[PDB]
Point group: C2
Chain length 240, copies 2
């Protein structure tokens, strides 16, 4: 079973301090015990504990394989942060479980404006990677202005913008715009939604306006639903 993260495994047999502590102290494993490792960059490694020190754990690598990513294309969720950090952190973990390549926390007219710490979110993604047995974790970006996302998202991507609130004066669904074979980015707004002016700018740049369904979702739940829309479409649209 369990997978450990060792980003420097290709150049070093010393495991990171945190993984070492867990493996030796918490799990009480010993020299000769086998381990699965990932570098976080698409590979799994078979390893055996060589040496256990008071502080550190050293392994030998016996073999290696490339992970086959269990979805197609690149999926980016670009989304407003939640007021409560627990909610966006719970969401991040779920997105990693489901399958995501990039999560961008944005700034928009009606969004929360506090600086978001990238490192804690990275650690949460790494944790969900190991838990769900994946060999990669998404790119995380924080405090990115909405207009940067609109202007600079690679235009070969299907770029969807989700909005709900009645005041924002037609939509369609992700199934109307998403094609397997292309990258996809979904932009999801704050509790107060995107402004009309933000939407026009999105559409001018080639974004397609979408609904995620008929229920009124919290921000973090809309991130999850949007990502699952993509996975669902990749499955229920397989030909054969």
């Amino acid at each position: 079973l369990p997978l450990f993260y060792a980003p420097d495994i290709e150049q070093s047999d010393r495991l990171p301090d945190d993984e070492a502590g867990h493996i030796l102290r918490v799990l009480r494993m010993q020299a000769g015990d086998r381990l699965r490792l990932t570098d976080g960059r698409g590979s799994f490694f078979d390893a055996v504990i060589e040496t256990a020190d008071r502080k550190s754990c050293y392994v030998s690598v016996c073999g290696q394989e490339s992970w086959q990513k269990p979805w197609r294309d690149r999926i980016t969720i670009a989304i407003a942060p939640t007021k409560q950090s627990e909610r966006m952190e719970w969401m991040l973990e779920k997105l990693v479980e489901i399958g995501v390549d990039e999560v961008v926390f944005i700034e928009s007219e009606h969004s929360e404006r506090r600086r978001i710490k990238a490192e804690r979110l990275e650690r949460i993604a790494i944790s969900a990677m190991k838990q769900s047995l994946k060999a990669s974790f998404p790119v995380i970006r924080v405090n990115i202005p909405i207009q940067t996302v609109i202007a600079d998202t690679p235009k070969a991507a299907v770029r969807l913008i989700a909005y709900v609130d009645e005041a924002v004066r037609g939509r369609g669904y992700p199934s109307d715009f998403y094609h397997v074979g292309q990258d996809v980015l979904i932009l999801i707004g704050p509790e107060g939604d995107f402004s009309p002016s933000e939407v026009e700018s999105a559409l001018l740049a080639g974004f397609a306006p979408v609904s995620l369904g008929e229920s009124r979702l919290r921000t973090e739940t809309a991130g999850l639903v949007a990502c699952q829309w993509i996975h669902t479409l990749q499955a229920c649209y397989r030909i054969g």
Copy 2:
């Protein structure tokens, strides 16, 4: 406009204490101010604050309407409870947002045998109902034997059993079996998954074996994903 919960609104013009406190003491609203209530049984009510006391908030009701549920058919998630109840609290909140009619916590061979904090789950369901502007919250069942779910779920209903693990494993996807117009129940197992014989029994009864995707999901995530599969399928066919 925020929505408040007043289950007794048809018999009483006194608001429940937690809502009264929030409205007067936290939100600072006063008599003459308009409110939206639900009884949690499918109706919204238009109301006005009439009187505030040192202890109570009294309203008058000036309109009532039946809620239009934002999905079709009935959706049931029948799931093994996680060791930690916090995971199940998060899941239920999101299921209520997304849209579900019934959530059934099961007992199966490998499932966690524990009391479910059912009062807590109702409270979460009620909060999610109010946040997402719904007028009802799902039926929540606890400690239901898996064999009861297998045997007694109506045959008219699309019945899916999700399983993933190697020893147990052809599966389709929920889209190979569900089409709009029919009720749906999805059976989701514990960490150890359903045993072979549970699968066999379910399959004997007419359940369809499904995969939810290629990713390894925690129990709580699989609940959400299965529910969303249904909503997605419904949207595609509007």
